[PDB]
Amino acid sequence: MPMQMFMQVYDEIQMFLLEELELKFDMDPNRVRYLRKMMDTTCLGGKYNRGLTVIDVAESLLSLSGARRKRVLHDACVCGWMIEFLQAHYLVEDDIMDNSHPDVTVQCAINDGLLLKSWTHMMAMHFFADRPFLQDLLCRFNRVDYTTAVGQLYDVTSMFDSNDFAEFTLSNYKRIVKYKTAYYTYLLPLVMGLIVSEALPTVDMGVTEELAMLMGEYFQVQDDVMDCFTPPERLGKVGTDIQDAKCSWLAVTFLAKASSAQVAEFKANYGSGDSEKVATVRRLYEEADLQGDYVAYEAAVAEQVKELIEKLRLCSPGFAASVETLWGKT
Amino acid sequence: MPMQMFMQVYDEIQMFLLEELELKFDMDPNRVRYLRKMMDTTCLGGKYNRGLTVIDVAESLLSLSGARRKRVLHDACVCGWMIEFLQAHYLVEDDIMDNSHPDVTVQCAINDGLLLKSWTHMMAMHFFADRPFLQDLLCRFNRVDYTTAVGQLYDVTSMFDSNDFAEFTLSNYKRIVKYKTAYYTYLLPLVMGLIVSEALPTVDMGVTEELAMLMGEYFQVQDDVMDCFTPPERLGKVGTDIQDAKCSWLAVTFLAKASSAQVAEFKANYGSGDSEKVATVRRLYEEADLQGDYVAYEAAVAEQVKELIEKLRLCSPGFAASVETLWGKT
Numbered sequence A, B: 001m002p003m004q005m006f007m008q009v010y011d012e013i014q015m016f017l018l019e020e021l022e023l024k025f026d027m028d029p030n031r032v033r034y035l036r037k038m039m040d041t042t043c044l045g046g047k048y049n050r051g052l053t054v055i056d057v058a059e060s061l062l063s064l065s066g067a068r069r070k071r072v073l074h075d076a077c078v079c080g081w082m083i084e085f086l087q088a089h090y091l092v093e094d095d096i097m098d099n100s101h102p103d104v105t106v107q108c109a110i111n112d113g114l115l116l117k118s119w120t121h122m123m124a125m126h127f128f129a130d131r132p133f134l135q136d137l138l139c140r141f142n143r144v145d146y147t148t149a150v151g152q153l154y155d156v157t158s159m160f161d162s163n164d165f166a167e168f169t170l171s172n173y174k175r176i177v178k179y180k181t182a183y184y185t186y187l188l189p190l191v192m193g194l195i196v197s198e199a200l201p202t203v204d205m206g207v208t209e210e211l212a213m214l215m216g217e218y219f220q221v222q223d224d225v226m227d228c229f230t231p232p233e234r235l236g237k238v239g240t241d242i243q244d245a246k247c248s249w250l251a252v253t254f255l256a257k258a259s260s261a262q263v264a265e266f267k268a269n270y271g272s273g274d275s276e277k278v279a280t281v282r283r284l285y286e287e288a289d290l291q292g293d294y295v296a297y298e299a300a301v302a303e304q305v306k307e308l309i310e311k312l313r314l315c316s317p318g319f320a321a322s323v324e325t326l327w328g329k330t
């Protein structure tokens, strides 16, 4: 039912956006079909974890506060696709960075990123035109999108001096995860589920924000270890954190427990595309028992998650039920 | 006074945005100074025609409807920088297209474009938090920004079939100018001046929209001719429309009055970087007396502008005074 309802609202959102271009923006059929294919390519195929989370939060809050049910569930589906379209926008922007007479494919890629972001505003201005939360929804959405761009600046420039392993600390790693990932992947779906369910001021946002940062931290730590050790055919992609000199959990943890001579070996091999220098870094990670510390670190984080949900259910019982389902997905 | 007030509000906007990053987004001083320099580089140095137009519309409407004066003038300055920041965002996106181990300069350029756009929302959500028009201002702003991205798709793909000179018509040229340029350069400053002056529903938006498209058309036609004939040291840049196979006013006008054999010579030379093929295209433009038709076309457009302002002053006299000043700038 939830996935089937989420996909029906996608067709409704897509048909409005394309017809709006056809009727109000003077677009020709060739470009409408071009944008339909681009929308399907960039927005569909994922797991829709962010979008479905908005639905799960909405349905749990109407079970513990007829016509208001069908409207709130539909409003949550539009908000779910706002995040999915926003994620598709971030992914297109990421493809432009590593992808490199005007090059029309780069022009269309940049244009795709602008259209995907603008579509989040257009679908919200339309389906929520008569909603009292439309102003507050756009402001929290824009602020979280701004947060993500700030986190990308932290992540991209973690190895230099913005006109270098000094910022390779655990607190800066959390700052990167918090702004670059946790806010729009974990906090934003929960907030949007509260907004459409009219139960925004009924929750302790401090514990809600704290759980979102902790769950995003738990997910990013596991994602860092898999990027290094999980082979490509099982991970689904090629792990490239070592070559790209990313501020990963493995890097900042290794630097705290490595000897002075091992740090020199790590610095001399980190951030290189050479096959042996990457293997030398993986060897240093192995010999430091980092995958042993990974299990304990996630266990301690999981305990903080398993216990912070209880603070949230004392005043918001139904809200904590969906947060548990979101944590179980992680 | 207007330019001096516009620059004082810039310092106020910049200081808030950077302090917000420092206080609420956990940003280090090295990156704050990095973003201050980037903001000054991308947002300052232009002519501020879009930003100052918002101020001129605001001051003309308070002269023909104490504390409300200083607030409206300040609100117009924030709206003026919203457009300037938006223009700076478009310019950064344009530099990424022709600019082409992770390349950190492309990553920062993409990050710059996202931050400049988000800053328009942040400065509006802050300085207009207690304004009744904040919701309507964001929606019209987002819709015009969406319009610009649609116009960029029309412009970029005017020579191919979105997965070719058929779309090289005068009506499609107007469509490109209308969506890509006229809406955010001419219509948006006028609308924002009306919003901060509380006189939005007091004007005939049909004539206002019509004047905006005509003025943007008048400006783009002159800009097309200068891109081809004005030498680089006098134009300020290198004209590249012929090499880039742009759907310029010269191209669509030439194709209507050229012989069948001249069209074959135009098609065989258009869109090439060869120095002689570009000169062959300029020769075809010269021999067709296109710079003679350019004077008459602009004169007819100027007549439609000089006469549509009169329809607007019968119900909005003070509003048409600023539209005349904006047209005089063109």
Ligand SMILES: Brc1ccccc1Oc1cccnn1
Residues within 6 Å of the ligand: A047, A049, A050, A053, A185, A186, A219, A326, A329, A330
């Ligand atoms: Br939300 C969410 C729920 C469960 C597990 C992970 C989650 O975050 C992401 C991040 C990237 C891609 N897909 N999901």
Ligand SMILES: Brc1ccccc1Oc1cccnn1
Residues within 6 Å of the ligand: B047, B049, B050, B053, B185, B186, B219, B326, B329, B330
């Ligand atoms: Br607004 C405006 C007023 C007068 C003349 C032109 C205008 O538009 C542009 C376009 C690009 C750069 N600068 N100004």
Ligand code: NA
Residues within 6 Å of the ligand: A046, A047, A048, A049, A050, A051, A084, A087
């Ligand atoms: Na998702």
Ligand code: NA
Residues within 6 Å of the ligand: B046, B047, B048, B049, B050, B051, B084, B087
């Ligand atoms: Na301007």
